[PDB]
Amino acid sequence: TPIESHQVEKRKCNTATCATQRLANFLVHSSNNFGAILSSTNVGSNTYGKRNAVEVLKREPLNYLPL
Known about the structure:
By secondary structure, the protein is an all-alpha fold. It has one domain. It has helices spanning about 15-30, 30-40, 50-60. Belongs to the calcitonin family. GO terms for molecular function: amyloid-beta binding; hormone activity; identical protein binding; lipid binding; receptor ligand activity; signaling receptor binding.
């Protein structure tokens, strides 16, 4: 009589979603440069600092208070 097949497959990462995952690796892949990058923050390229997020929140506490 016949017997169930033993076919096996995998779920390789071949989708766009996986692409985002590589972005996370970029932070660690460029973590060393990040240090030297913040050093020249006074080069007029500090208009994208992450801390800006915590600042704007302070300037606009309305969003924090009940709405």
